[PDB]
Design a binder for these strands. Structure first.
Ligand SMILES: [Mg+2]
Ligand SMILES: [Zn+2]
Lengths: 244, 100, 386, 136, 455, 42
RNA sequence: GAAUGUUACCGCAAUAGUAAUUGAACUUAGUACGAGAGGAACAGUUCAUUCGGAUAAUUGGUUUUUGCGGCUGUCUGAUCA
RNA sequence: GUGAACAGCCUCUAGUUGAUAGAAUAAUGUAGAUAAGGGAAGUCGGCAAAAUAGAUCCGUAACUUCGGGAUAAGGAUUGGC
């Protein structure tokens, strides 16, 4: 279920990590506390790989992938690609992408079935993403936010968007993604939901600054806790009204 | 190690040598030495410079298309790095050098 | 007047006087503390600065932002052919400093050291150490008596060694002679080791190894008379000031009526003895090991010699020592390699290096190729080829 | 590094002395930022404080929205335009120097960053990387 | 400001403050001047000394004035607490005296500087400087009592509780020793004396707890007696005004046992008397020490008082005991529900759906079979964190990334990629089935050789 | 900050020296001695 | 730089000067401490401001290498030069 | 000849080789230059350098004594066959 975790002293879990339904990536910065924090929830069930992208700890924003495959920017060295492939099973596709944009994690927000991309993403990159991830691709922006990969979080169970998302925009995007969406905040009101936390079909990790109401909202929307597929969110309505 | 072919003269750009230029369009251009960078600053056309490999390619010198040149494709596939495959790749490179 | 503004002074007052070094070969001021428990070993070595080169290595340094990354940094290549011990010096501790008791030569001095004792070598009759060598006559009691005297009273033992200049591509034929202190207990064992090493050669691999921290001492680059502006970094005057602008404008005051020694005036710059410590050794290449410049990654049959040879240096053919950073002294200058004088195993030194690739492209101009084969492959056949 | 910055920063060429003007790289509406001071700068006689890629500086909006005028706000440099030695073994520079206005905690004001973002700045500022669509 | 004004700068007494200022002026400023110096130099020196002394005194007074909370127009609850504790009249008088002393020092310094600017001799300038210093010293000495009082009130206010009136909070009321402190200790983690003597808590105690992911804070008070408020102690007035000002929902505690020798009739009379304060608080009655009374075994005549208390619309009776703390949870839940309902009602004065536009959640079998990690289990996982700890901890242990990464055979796991071979790096040529392409190239070479291509 | 003449830092460095720091130098010297003996054995 | 039999090599050191300075990133930490707000410290690590000593590995700058190529006027009859 | 030009430079008739020289190119100067990023943040003070400089074409404001401003300003080209 939802678990609170922090980097060295940063609450942006998604910046320094990328968690999928079959593999997880963490930065090599400082120590293994982040690696041990991820292990405490996933253990040895799925591979956990220490890897860097372009010699930086921001691999989470630089890379985007799902259970079917992983995508890395052109700036990634061949050594990092080989290490990632060897640390990952052959069932996970890995391929480099060549385009003007490089922040794949911020440019692409996707799950195992549907993917959102930057409106200006080129045709070749869109086709490559579709082929690699086996997911539908749609040109969309979250209530005018062009960085779909940073201001939104998506998973097969549900998705989360920044609070400024209009109700009509939320309704349209939920129907397009075929998953429920809720407007909320992470890391004590931080608007970058896609960078402040990572989530999959069975695990969610967020910054320590995430207040109890935010954690409960995340649990309800992403359907982590048993017998809580947003059902308990109805009870959270009164709590949100009192707090808001 | 990702030794690059010079954007101007296609010559190898070893680590610690040359300058890299990043355009507002996110286009990365690597210049092996000051000559190529300064020529690019002056917007000189490499295809019209007799000392640039790009000009020679179109001029019919140092044939641009050959079977051997297909082995040097900048692949994006992370091959599983098999030791036997590694040795075969070294042998293939050694043979391809002589063939080319 | 309190100057209205506090700022650091220009230059280091501890390095004065800023005068030329006594000799081209700087003499070591101190040697590592003798560890009586450790075996006998050479505490230093003499080499020649061959040049510099670029090295890229995957850095293993936990806690650093460059962990598991290939950081490019400069290294210095020093030509260090095997050295030969040709004598030993015994010192006795006196109330007025260490005093030399006696010295013994190994019955046979090479022509290189013979040249060192004469200025007009060709004119000289070459009446070399022959007379003292005759002390090794049938009985040879004199040599044994001197050795026993050294054993009885000498507190520390220093061996006399000279670099094989003929093995160096230097144009000169005269070699350099200097003393090196011997470490280890059983001072009798020190002189026994020296005697067993008489006329024998010692390689750098038996003194330094990879990852070992060493201190280099040598005479710095000379530049002759230099203005105070660059000799001390003095601020330049605005423009066209009377009596010039590249000088200290105020030299004194009403009291004292004398120029202070710390006013940092102009004078000779460079050619001063300097001590640099904590130089990490990256590569120890054997003279007879082909492909000295080949790492576990490159594995190409190429030596460390840059294409066309080192600038203002030769075609190194023997053992050499590679150390990170830079060392004072110009190419062709003799540089002495000295131990750290202390336990310098800080994680910076304890970490093991692993060179990913070694730069061997021409330092003469903007060299783009590492070996002539690569140049031929890229440029292809030329008019003169066929 | 200072507050907001994460981890240590290796020294790079200082191409933005005090009083320099750099184009705004965020959609907050500002056009260019006039640097008046550099956070974490050194103290030395006659030495003008200078910024670099990834450094946090205080700058005023010389042009742009009237609301942003006459007030100095912290900013983070995303481009330098002065060649700096990358540890990878390459000297690189950007076409034009630019910066993004940020709060003392390093949070981004604009929802998007235009143009390439320096690798050092993106690594040193998680929020900048999250708000950066193009890195290098 | 509000919320624990702990950062007030400490203020020394008049004598200590004057000594500190004089020492600072004597030390920081120069003290050597000679009659042979020009009269302008002596005048400037003495004027600078006087200005420095005046600036130091002004800075001290300004810091003291700024540090204090400015009781006026802070908040009715905090303002009333300060008035009851520090005698708001005296506190304001002392702070106004400090402000007046600051202005007097400023005027004295300015006048003496103006007078000294016309100095004609070293002795005259020295006398003028001494006169200014003596005037400042006398002004400071006149501030003896206010500074001493302000030091104590500053300490107390720094050590006072910091409750947020706008937040949802609980309040416990009743006779002393009825169990208010015990209830506060049990409901929430706090340090409060639970002794049975008359007045266990001499001031307000605060304790935080979380209900339904909402932050709540409980407030304990010394309590009040049956006095008609004509005569009352500051201790009781604190509770009275805390009840009055705070939006908190108040709980009236009662003890039916022989302890708390104000009988049940006295408790009911106190409840009726405080009823006006209970109008808008949505009050609830909590019967404490139920373990020894069990009001179900209470006389009907005595239960008549409980019924009369129940006659009030919004009151309810709850049963709890200190030893049987389980009822504390029920009381907390009831109070939180009432407060939340009231706040939701006052406030008024959503998720999206796919809509169908197959995809289902995916979980690996390993995760399903994975066992929950236990930090306190001796047999828990290796904890790669602990592995690094046993190898030197963070910053020392070197993690071998090659240990875990998967390869076809572990016998070559610790291998190295050449990455370069005389140009045309290996990674570019890395591709399976090299034999097929090599054989095709060999066939092409064989064709060319017999074709006479290479003459 | 603490200078080189800082007693606590010097004590910590001395303890580190008695730690694996001195053992590393001892191992290095032992390795060098083998090559020194080989120089004569050859 | 003469003079201490002469030249040369290797040395000891009386004496004079001296130096390094400060900040931050993890770990320990969201732990002691707290009702909550918040927030410790030592040991091991890693970077950084200022100052000092070196060297051009690599990059920039500098050109009388006037080294190479180009351009205006004019002259050697034209071309080359 | 070039060139608007008795503007600057080369050559033709004609007149000179006259200014003590030789060997290096240390510091500091005399005269003339180049420079990565910022572009006056230096200085009492844009002190000194720098920037546009000729020709052709578009176009040219406030004021005014209606004569002027004006080459205002602000913009595009200049080679050879
Ligand atoms: Mg009590
Ligand atoms: Zn090139």
């Amino acid at each position: 279920m939802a678990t609170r975790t922090q980097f060295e002293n940063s609450n942006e879990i998604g910046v320094f990590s990328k968690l999928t339904n079959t593999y997880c990536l963490v930065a090599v910065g400082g120590s293994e506390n982040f690696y041990s924090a991820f292990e405490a929830e996933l253990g040895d069930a799925i591979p956990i790989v220490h890897t860097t992208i372009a010699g930086t700890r921001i691999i989470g924003r630089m890379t985007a992938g799902n259970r079917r495959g992983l995508l890395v920017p052109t700036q990634t060295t061949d050594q990092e690609l080989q290490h990632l492939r060897n640390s990952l099973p052959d069932s996970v596709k890995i391929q480099r992408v060549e385009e003007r944009l490089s922040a794949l994690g911020n440019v692409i927000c996707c799950n195992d079935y549907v993917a959102l991309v930057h409106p200006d993403i080129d045709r070749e990159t869109e086709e490559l993403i579709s082929d690699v991830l086996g997911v539908e691709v749609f040109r969309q922006t979250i209530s005018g936010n062009i960085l779909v990969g940073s201001y939104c979080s998506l998973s097969n169970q549900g998705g989360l968007v920044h609070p400024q998302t209009s109700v009509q925009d939320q309704e349209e995007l939920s129907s397009l993604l075929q998953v429920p969406l809720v407007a909320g905040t992470v890391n004590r009101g931080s608007s970058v939901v896609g960078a402040g936390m990572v989530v999959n079909d069975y695990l969610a990790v967020t910054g320590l600054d995430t207040t109890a109401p935010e954690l409960s909202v995340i649990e309800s929307i992403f359907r982590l806790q048993d017998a809580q597929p947003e059902s308990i969110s109805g009870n959270l309505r009164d709590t949100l009204i009192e707090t808001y | 190690m990702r030794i690059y072919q010079c954007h101007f003269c296609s010559s190898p750009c070893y680590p610690g040598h040359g300058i890299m230029f990043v355009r507002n369009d996110a286009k990365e251009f690597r210049f092996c030495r000051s000559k190529c960078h300064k020529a690019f600053k002056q917007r000189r056309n490499p295809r019209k410079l007799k000392w640039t490999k790009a000009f020679r390619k179109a001029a019919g010198k140092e044939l641009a298309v050959d079977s051997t040149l297909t082995f040097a494709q900048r692949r994006n596939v992370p091959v599983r790095y098999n030791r036997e495959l590694v040795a075969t790749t070294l042998k293939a490179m050694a043979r391809i050098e002589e063939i080319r | 007047s309190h100057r209205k503004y506090e700022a650091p002074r220009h230059g280091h007052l501890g390095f004065l006087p800023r005068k030329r070094a006594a000799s081209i070969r700087a003499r070591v001021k101190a040697f590592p503390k003798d560890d009586r428990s450790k075996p006998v070993a050479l505490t230093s070595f003499l080499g020649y600065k061959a040049g510099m080169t670029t090295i890229v290595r995957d850095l293993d340094r936990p806690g650093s932002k460059f962990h598991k990354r290939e950081v490019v940094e400069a290294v210095t290549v020093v030509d260090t052919p095997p050295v030969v011990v040709v004598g030993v010096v015994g010192y006795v501790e006196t109330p007025r400093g260490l005093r030399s008791l006696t010295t013994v030569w190994a019955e046979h001095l090479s022509d290189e050291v013979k040249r060192r004792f004469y200025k007009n070598w060709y004119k000289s009759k070459k009446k070399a150490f022959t007379k003292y060598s005759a002390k090794y006559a049938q009985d040879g009691a004199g040599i044994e008596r001197e050795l026993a005297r050294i054993k009885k009273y000498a507190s520390v033992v220093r061996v006399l060694v000279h670099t094989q200049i003929r093995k160096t591509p230097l144009a000169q034929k005269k070699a350099h002679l200097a003393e090196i202190q011997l470490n280890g207990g059983s001072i009798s064992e020190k002189v026994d080791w020296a005697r067993e090493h008489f006329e024998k050669t010692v390689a750098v691999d038996s003194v330094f190894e990879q990852n070992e921290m060493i201190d280099a001492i040598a005479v710095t680059k000379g530049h002759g008379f230099e203005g105070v502006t660059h000799r001390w970094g003095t601020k330049k005057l605005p423009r066209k000031t009377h009596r010039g602008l590249r000088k200290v404008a105020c030299i004194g005051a009403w009291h004292p009526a004398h120029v202070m020694w710390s006013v940092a005036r102009a004078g000779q710059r460079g050619y001063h003895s300097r001590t640099s410590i904590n130089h990490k050794i990256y590569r120890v290449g054997k003279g007879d090991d082909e492909a000295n410049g080949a790492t576990s990654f490159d594995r190409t049959k190429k030596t460390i010699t840059p294409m066309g040879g080192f600038v203002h240096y030769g075609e190194i053919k023997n053992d050499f020592i590679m150390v990170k950073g830079c060392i004072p002294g110009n190419r062709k200058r003799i540089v002495t390699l000295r131990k750290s004088l202390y336990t310098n195993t800080s994680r910076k030194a304890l970490e093991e290096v692993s060179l990913k690739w070694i730069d061997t492209a021409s330092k003469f101009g903007k060299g783009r190729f590492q070996t002539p084969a690569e140049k031929h492959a890229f440029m292809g056949t030329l008019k003169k080829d066929l | 590094s200072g507050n907001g910055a994460q981890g240590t920063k290796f020294r790079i060429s200082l191409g933005l002395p005090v009083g320099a003007i750099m184009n705004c790289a965020d959609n907050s509406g500002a056009r260019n930022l006039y640097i008046i001071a550099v956070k974490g700068s050194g103290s030395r006689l006659n030495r003008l404080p200078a910024a670099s890629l990834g450094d946090m500086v205080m700058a005023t909006v010389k042009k742009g929205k009237p609301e942003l005028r006459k007030k100095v706000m912290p900013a983070i440099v995303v481009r330098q335009a002065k060649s700096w030695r990358r540890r990878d073994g390459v000297f690189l520079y950007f076409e034009d120097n630019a910066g993004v206005i940020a709060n003392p905690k390093g949070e981004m004001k604009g929802s998007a960053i235009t143009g390439p973002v320096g690798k050092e700045c993106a690594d040193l500022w998680p929020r900048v990387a999250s708000n950066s669509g193009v890195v290098v | 400001m509000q919320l624990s004004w702990k950062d007030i700068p400490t203020v020394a007494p008049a004598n200590d403050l004057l000594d500190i200022v004089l020492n600072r002026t004597q030390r920081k400023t120069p003290t050597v001047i000679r009659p042979g110096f020009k009269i302008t130099r002596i005048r400037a020196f003495y004027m600078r000394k006087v200005k420095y002394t005046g600036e130091g005194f002004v800075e001290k007074f300004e810091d003291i004035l700024k540090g204090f909370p400015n009781i006026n127009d802070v908040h009715p609850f905090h303002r009333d607490l300060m008035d009851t504790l520090y005698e708001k009249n005296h506190y304001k008088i002392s702070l106004a005296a400090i402000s007046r002393a600051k202005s007097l020092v400023e005027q004295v310094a300015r006048d003496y500087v103006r007078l000294l600017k016309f100095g004609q001799s070293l002795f005259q300038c020295k006398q003028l400087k001494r006169a200014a210093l003596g005037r400042m010293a006398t002004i400071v000495k006149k501030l003896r009592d206010p500074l001493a009082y302000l030091e104590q009130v500053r300490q107390h206010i720094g050590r006072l509780p910091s409750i947020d009136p706008n937040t949802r909070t609980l309040l416990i009321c009743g006779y002393p020793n009825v169990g208010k402190s015990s209830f506060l200790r049990c409901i929430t983690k706090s340090d409060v004396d639970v002794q049975p003597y008359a007045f266990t808590t001499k001031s307000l105690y605060v304790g935080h707890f979380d209900y339904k992911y909402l932050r709540f804070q409980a407030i304990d008070t010394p309590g009040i007696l049956d006095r008609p408020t004509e005569e009352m102690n500051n201790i009781e007035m604190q509770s009275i005004y805390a009840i009055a000002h705070l939006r908190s929902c108040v709980l009236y505690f009662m003890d039916l046992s022989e302890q708390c020798g104000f009988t049940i009739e006295a408790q009911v009379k106190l409840f009726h008397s405080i009823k006006p304060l209970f109008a808008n608080k949505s009050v609830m009655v909590v019967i404490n020490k139920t373990d020894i009374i069990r009001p179900e075994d209470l006389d009907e005549e005595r239960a008549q008082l409980l019924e009369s208390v129940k006659e009030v619309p919004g009151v309810e009776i709850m049963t709890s005991s200190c030893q049987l703390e389980e009822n504390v949870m029920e009381v907390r839940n009831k109070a939180c529900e009432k407060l939340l309902a009231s706040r939701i009602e006052n406030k008024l004065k959503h998720v999206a759906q796919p809509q169908a536009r197959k995809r289902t959640p995916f979980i690996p079998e390993s995760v399903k079979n994975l066992k929950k990690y236990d930090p306190e289990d001796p047999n828990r996982r290796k904890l790669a964190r602990d592995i690094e700890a046993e190898n030197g901890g963070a910053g020392v242990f070197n993690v071998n990334l090659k240990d875990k990464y998967l390869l076809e055979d572990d016998e070559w796991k610790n291998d190295i990629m050449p990455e370069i071979l005389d140009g045309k790096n290996v990674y570019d040529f890395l591709d399976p089935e090299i034999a097929a392409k090599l054989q095709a190239l060999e066939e092409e070479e064989e064709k060319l050789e017999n074709e006479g291509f290479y003459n | 900050a603490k200078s080189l003449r800082a007693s606590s830092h010097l004590n910590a460095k001395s303890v580190k020296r008695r730690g694996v720091f001195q053992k590393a130098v001892d191992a290095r010297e032992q390795r060098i001695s083998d090559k020194l003996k080989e120089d004569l054995l050859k």
